[PDB]
Design a protein around this ligand. Structure first.
Ligand SMILES: Nc1ncnc2c1ncn2[C@@H]1O[C@H](COP(=O)(O)OP(=O)(O)O)[C@@H](O)[C@H]1O
Ligand SMILES: [Zn+2]
Ligand SMILES: [Zn+2]
Lengths: 58, 488, 114, 562, 148
């Protein structure tokens, strides 16, 4: 549904990080800027695994 | 930005743009324009890294806007001019322009004719003694809700080349007329034009004219009549020209217009503002079953989409023309034809004016109070302007008598129809119901010699009560009005 | 036990019906509603009666379109016209004074019940 | 049989021997209007007769009664008649009351000659045996199916006519059974009129780039429902394009070029957006099922997968960024296999000249079809309406000229609007499920809908019919069934009924299916007292009254000839 | 019950053809009396049986057809005369024409006839139909000279 209307926002529930990999939620709560600087690359790779050549759109 | 394409719940964003060389002075404020250009960034003198955006204009296109700043100049192409001449040579262009206005509104044919007369307008004249006379007509649609008056206002704003649509509640004295604002950098006062400056040379439309404030209504009097706004505020005095044709819509003071109620109670307007208006169209709902079933079928055909098919077929038939062609024809007829009057037309016009003033005597005799809807010399000027607009439909430089009787018909349909809205009555009714029986007739001379020469009643009581028995439909008139017949 | 559909589903259902499903009146009757509007204009002749204008026919058309939108069906059926006419007639009868509610109920009973 | 292909040239010589006279006009070409193939065929014929100076009168005809009215008022001076796109099914002597005794001149010696020649240029493969065999006056331009298939019927008809107990019954009833087996057979097309006339031009030697382009348009116009014909005639067009192309270059205002390049199976690709081309295509909606909201979601998802933004995809093709449209073939090759759209890849003919842009054959024939369709007491209305589509046909003839590209752009805009209306009425049919299953045929009756006054036109109803056959053909769960498509006209108050043949999906690759509606229509018209119109050249197009519709469909579903 | 019965024809509840109209247009001659029993009755030529038209209702004595033809001529010319002498009323004011020759009313409505334009031609068409049915050759000749 990110790819459906060419959106660029991927919503992540923090409770999902609380249930699984709570160390990642702690690192996001303590140092948010560097964590999001890794997270956007991670989400872009996860998008390109499902939508190849999506970098031409966004 | 375009109001049809605004996002949900937000405000239209103003964006600063620039023109150079021959692209300058091409657009009047208020037009709708399509612009091609580069989206560049310039640094402004007014946080972090904020550089304000602008658009450098490379191209301007607008079908609604013509001739840049107005110079009464003929920029229409030659084959379009020949097509426009063919339209002016059409024997029934009047019905084409009538059907072009509001194709999805049933009825209101006289309103559509007055709208076409408003769009063409009269002719502005200049006298050697400085006497400036009005070349525009102002039309007020007063009536019940559900008569689609505001839809007519919206369609007039669409058809007219220069037009603005305003409110009665959302208006202000400095909003309709020109306002005095302050420049931020220089701290000097300057006049910024309002809604009647953006509609200069065109149409202003007012919705809910009954509700706009009493201090707000009366800043418009010189702008309707004198075609100018004289402002002396904050050390700035000037007389700006505002040649605006005014189209206002209103409801009565009571919730619906009541035929049982007196016309004075329904209208709390002053007589000045109805003297300034030219068509005072009072509209009602008579609840006729044929009219209700016809409007029901018409609005059903509009909602289902079959009216799209009927108007698309009738455009190719040739009895209707679209918004763009009628808009350019309005511009061409205002920029080409400004007619005078034949000497034989003046006799008919002056004779009809003294006839309707003599009828206003009869209208104001029995009520003993002044009528709220006056007929003055400005209404004679109104009928003059209607005649000149009827000549301006077909590019006729002479307003002949054929246009004159249609102008008289329009004025009788609007203003004379609006203005026409104890023991003697009951004693006459009893004496006449006992006098002539059911199914027999009596000549009017018999009633004149036995009910006026006897001085049983007055002649005015007879003339009123015969109409009173006519509208009750138990006693009617037959044989050219010379016989009174009891229907029973 | 208080509502058949959950509220969290219902709010998203209303939003999805508003922003995606646009019904249209194509295979409707469009003659019964004409007689309904004509009879409403005929019985709106009373002094204190609820006024009926062309906007109320258009109101019948939006109520039928909203009833078609509630089912997420892009076309309006005759059942939606019947329910819209039933709502508007019931509102007009409830607006009327109790001296004539029986007469007004029996006058429009052929349009709502059938 | 009377003209095989190798003697088409000879037939043209006979036309000259009856019509090459400067003083008088003697050649009248009856053209079936509302047909792209006949339009291109008559355009090539008119260019050929203009280059040799033959006087001509081109008359467009809609109905069979219109044909009889035009032939009845013809002068006796006319000796050459050309019937383009029709006249191959009916018996023209029994229809035009033709008797050879009052038309014969100088019979003396076994030689016969006539004062009028009537040539038939018809693509409908049911050929009347009297017309093709026993008629001297009616001369057929046969493709060559008479020499391969129609020999048994030839000998059956010849021993039927030659021989005017058990031996006589045993042979005559057998030959009549063979003849009645050839009759009551469905209608099909395997060759185009433009291909036959271009073969005539190859035999004469008047071929050039314009006649080749008109032949390409005439062949391409049959690709909707007769794709086997286009697949058969494609290599001849490829050979002719590579033959009459020049040696080579830089884009210059005078060099017309006509390339064999990838022209994808899309509706108006080069004159609309890519989103509107995929969205309004019959094949894309046929496979991905674009009529519901899930198909639109899948179309947006494959736009995400192809890497084309919806802002770029909705932009006009001419103004589109060419980082999308240059390697669009590579993107099509990589991405369309997962969504099943492999058959979008198709090589076609694209013509351009000067700097005014490129046009494909498919876009040009949809523009011409749109200009046929919506290009511009009841009997007067029918006469005025027939005059309206004749004016539409001549407007589309005006669009065939090179100097009138504004008519072509008007046809492009009309094709866009008409495809929007066709899409809206198609999803109107599909959403409310008006398609009814009658176990031998599928029934679709339009009672009311958006802009129903466009469906008094035949080809618009055929466009809706081909839309429905393409949409239902890819659904394998329902098998191949014939379709009845009826549309109501309120002012005329008639149901115009079209018979549509089903087809296999385009990805498969056999024997074409026939059109069995004309036989049932004729038999029901003969048996019942239905006031119906059979006069259309396509015999699956009839007009019934509203009140006689349901008995006609009950007699149709009772009859087993569907 | 009518709603359920109209479903089988595939018609709606309030269709244009579903509503009822009377299939007989009323042609009445006023006060035609027999000479035998003096029963003064109005004879309707469309809605009555042919047995009860040419004879008396009570006396059952046959009228001659000639005076029936004469009374239809009288009724036709009465309707035509009532068309030619006619007040003109406003489309809006519904006021009778007092000034006998003028363009329009002071209410600016058009002049229309008190009798409809189509009422007289439907009356004459029903006269032509009843003349073609009952074989009134004098009435057929009257229509023949009226059309010419
Ligand atoms: N003759 C008509 N044709 C079509 N629509 C109508 C007609 N009369 C009324 N309506 C509908 O009723 C509404 C009437 O609103 P309107 O009377 O213009 O408001 P106001 O009372 O403020 O003037 C409009 O929205 C219009 O759509
Ligand atoms: Zn008697
Ligand atoms: Zn009047």
């Amino acid at each position: 549904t990110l790819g459906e209307m060419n959106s660029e926002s991927l919503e992540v529930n923090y409770r999902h990080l609380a249930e699984s990999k709570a160390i990642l939620a702690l690192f996001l709560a303590k140092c948010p800027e560097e964590m999001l600087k890794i997270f956007d690359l991670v989400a872009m790779e996860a998008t390109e695994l499902h939508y190849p050549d999506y970098a031409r759109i966004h | 930005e375009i109001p049809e394409l605004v996002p949900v719940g937000e405000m239209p964003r103003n964006l600063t743009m620039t023109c150079d060389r021959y692209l300058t002075n091409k657009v009047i404020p208020g037009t709708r324009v399509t612009i091609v250009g580069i989206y560049s960034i310039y640094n402004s003198k007014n946080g972090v890294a904020i550089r304000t955006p602008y658009i450098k204009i490379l191209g301007i296109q607008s079908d609604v806007e013509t001739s840049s700043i107005w110079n009464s100049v003929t920029m229409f192409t030659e084959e379009e001019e020949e097509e426009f001449l063919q339209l002016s040579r059409n024997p029934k262009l009047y019905e084409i322009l009538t059907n072009s206005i509001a194709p999805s509104i049933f009825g209101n044919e006289d309103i559509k004719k007055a709208i076409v007369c408003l769009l063409m307008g009269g002719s502005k004249k200049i006298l050697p003694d400085g006497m400036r006379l009005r070349g525009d007509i102002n039309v007020l649609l007063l009536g019940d809700p559900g008569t689609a008056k505001s839809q007519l206002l919206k369609f007039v704003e669409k058809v007219s080349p220069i037009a603005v649509y305003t409110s009665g509640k959302g208006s202000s004295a400095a909003g309709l007329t020109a306002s005095v604002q302050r420049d931020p950098m220089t701290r000097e006062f300057y006049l910024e034009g309002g809604a009647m400056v953006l509609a200069d040379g065109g149409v202003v439309c007012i919705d809910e004219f009954d509700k706009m404030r009493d201090e707000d209504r009366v800043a418009i009097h010189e702008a309707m009549e004198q075609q100018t706004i004289s402002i002396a505020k904050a050390g700035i005095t000037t007389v700006l020209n505002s040649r605006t044709s005014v189209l206002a819509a209103a409801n009565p003071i009571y919730g619906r217009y009541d035929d049982l109620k007196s016309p004075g109670d329904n209208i709390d307007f002053q007589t000045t503002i109805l003297s300034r208006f030219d068509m005072i169209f009072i509209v009602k709902d008579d609840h006729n079953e044929e009219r209700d079933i016809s409007i029901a079928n018409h609005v059903i055909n509009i909602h289902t989409g079959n009216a799209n098919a009927m108007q698309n077929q009738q455009e190719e038939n040739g009895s209707e023309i679209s918004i763009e062609k009628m808009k350019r024809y309005i511009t061409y007829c205002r920029l080409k034809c400004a007619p005078r009057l034949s000497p034989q037309a003046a006799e008919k016009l002056s004779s009809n004016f003294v006839t309707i003033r003599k009828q206003l005597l009869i209208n104001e005799l029995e009520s003993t109070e002044r009528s709220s809807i006056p007929i003055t010399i400005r209404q004679l000027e109104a009928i003059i302007r209607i005649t000149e607009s009827l000549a301006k439909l077909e590019l006729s430089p002479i307003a002949q008598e054929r246009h004159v009787d249609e102008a008289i018909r329009l004025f009788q349909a609007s203003t004379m129809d609006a203005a026409s809205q104890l023991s003697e009555i009951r004693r006459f009714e009893q004496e006449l119901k006992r006098r002539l029986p059911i199914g027999w007739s009596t000549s009017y001379q018999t009633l004149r010699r036995e009910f006026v020469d006897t001085h049983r009643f007055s002649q005015l009581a007879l003339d009123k009560a015969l109409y009173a028995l006519e509208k009750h439909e138990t006693i009617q008139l037959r044989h050219q009005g010379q016989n009174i017949y009891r229907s029973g | 036990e208080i509502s058949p559909i959950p509220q969290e589903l219902l709010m998203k259902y209303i939003h999805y019906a508003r922003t995606k499903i646009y019904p249209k009146l194509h295979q409707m009757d469009m003659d019964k509603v004409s007689r309904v509007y004509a009879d409403l204009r005929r019985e709106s002749i009373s002094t204190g009666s609820f006024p009926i204008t062309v906007r109320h026919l258009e109101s019948i058309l939006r109520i039928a379109e909203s009833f078609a939108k509630m089912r997420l069906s892009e076309f309006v059926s005759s059942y939606d016209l019947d329910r819209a006419i039933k709502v508007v007639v019931d509102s007009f009868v409830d607006a009327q004074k109790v001296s004539v509610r029986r007469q007004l109920r029996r006058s429009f009973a052929i349009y709502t019940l059938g | 049989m009377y003209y095989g292909i190798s003697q088409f040239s000879e037939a043209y010589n006979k036309i000259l021997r009856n019509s090459s006279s400067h003083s008088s006009c003697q050649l009248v070409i009856f053209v079936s209007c509302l047909n792209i193939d006949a339009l291109c065929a008559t355009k090539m014929l008119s260019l050929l007769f203009k280059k040799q100076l033959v006087q001509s009168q081109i008359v467009p005809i809609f109905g069979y009664s219109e044909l009889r009215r035009h032939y009845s008022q013809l002068d006796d001076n006319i000796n050459s008649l050309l019937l383009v796109g029709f006249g191959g099914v009916i018996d023209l002597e029994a229809f035009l009351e033709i008797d050879p005794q009052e038309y014969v001149i100088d019979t003396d010696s076994g030689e016969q000659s006539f004062r009028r020649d009537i040539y038939v240029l018809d693509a409908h493969r049911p050929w009347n045996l009297d017309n093709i065999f026993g008629s001297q006056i009616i001369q057929c331009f046969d493709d060559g199916t008479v020499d391969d298939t129609l020999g048994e019927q030839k000998e059956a008809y010849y021993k039927l006519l030659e021989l005017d107990r058990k031996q006589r019954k045993k042979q005559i009833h057998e030959y009549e059974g063979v003849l009645e087996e050839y009759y009551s057979q469905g209608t099909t097309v395997v060759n185009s009129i433009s291909a036959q006339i271009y073969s005539l031009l190859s035999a004469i030697g008047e071929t050039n780039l314009s006649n080749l382009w008109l032949n390409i348009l005439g062949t391409t116009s049959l690709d909707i429902a007769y794709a086997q014909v286009y697949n058969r005639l494609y290599p001849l067009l490829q050979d002719e394009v590579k033959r009459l192309t020049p040696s080579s270059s830089v884009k210059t205002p005078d060099t017309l070029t006509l390339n064999i390049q990838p022209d994808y199976y899309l509706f108006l690709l080069r004159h609309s957006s890519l989103y509107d081309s995929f969205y309004y295509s019959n094949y894309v909606n046929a496979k991905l099922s674009l009529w519901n909201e899930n198909g639109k979601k899948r179309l947006h998802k494959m736009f995400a997968r192809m890497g084309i933004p919806l802002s770029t995809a909705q932009e006009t093709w001419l103004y589109m960024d060419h980082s999308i449209k240059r390697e669009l073939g590579i993107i099509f090759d990589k991405n369309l296999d997962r969504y099943g759209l492999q058959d979008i890849i198709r090589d076609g003919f694209v013509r351009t000249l000067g700097y005014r842009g490129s046009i494909s054959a498919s876009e040009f024939v949809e523009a011409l079809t749109a200009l046929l369709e919506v290009g511009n007491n009841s009997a007067q209305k029918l006469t005025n309406l027939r005059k309206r589509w004749v004016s539409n046909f001549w407007l589309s003839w005006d669009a065939l000229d090179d100097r009138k590209v504004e008519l072509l752009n008007r046809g492009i805009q009309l094709a866009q609007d008409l495809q929007r209306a066709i899409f809206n009425t198609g999803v109107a049919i599909l959403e409310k499920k008006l398609i009814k299953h009658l176990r031998i045929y599928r029934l679709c009756v339009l009672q009311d809908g958006p802009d129903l006054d466009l469906y008094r036109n035949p080809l618009t109803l055929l466009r809706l019919g081909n839309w429905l056959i393409e949409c239902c053909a890819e659904s394998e769960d329902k098998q191949l069934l014939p379709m009845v498509l009826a549309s109501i006209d309120e002012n005329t108050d008639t149901y115009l009924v079209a018979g549509l043949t089903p087809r296999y999906p385009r990805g498969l690759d056999k024997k074409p299916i026939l059109n069995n509606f004309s036989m049932a229509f004729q038999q029901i018209t003969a048996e019942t007292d239905a006031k119906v119109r059979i006069d259309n050249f396509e015999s699956s197009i009839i007009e019934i009254r509203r009140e006689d519709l349901s008995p006609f469909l009950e007699k149709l579903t009772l009859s087993g000839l569907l | 019950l009518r709603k359920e019965l109209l479903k089988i024809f595939e018609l709606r509840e309030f269709a244009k053809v579903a509503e009822f109209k009377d299939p007989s247009l009323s042609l009445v001659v006023p006060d035609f009396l027999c000479e035998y029993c003096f029963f003064i009755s109005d004879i309707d030529f469309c809605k009555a049986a042919p047995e009860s038209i040419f004879s008396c209702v009570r006396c059952h004595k046959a009228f001659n057809q000639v005076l029936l033809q004469e009374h239809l001529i009288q009724k036709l010319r009465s309707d035509i005369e009532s068309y030619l002498i006619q007040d003109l009323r406003c489309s809006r004011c519904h006021k009778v024409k007092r000034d006998y020759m003028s363009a329009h009313c002071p209410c600016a409505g058009a002049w229309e006839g008190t009798l409809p334009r189509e009422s007289i031609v439907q009356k004459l068409n029903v006269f032509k139909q009843v003349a073609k049915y009952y074989g009134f050759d004098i009435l057929l000749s009257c229509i023949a000279d009226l059309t010419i």
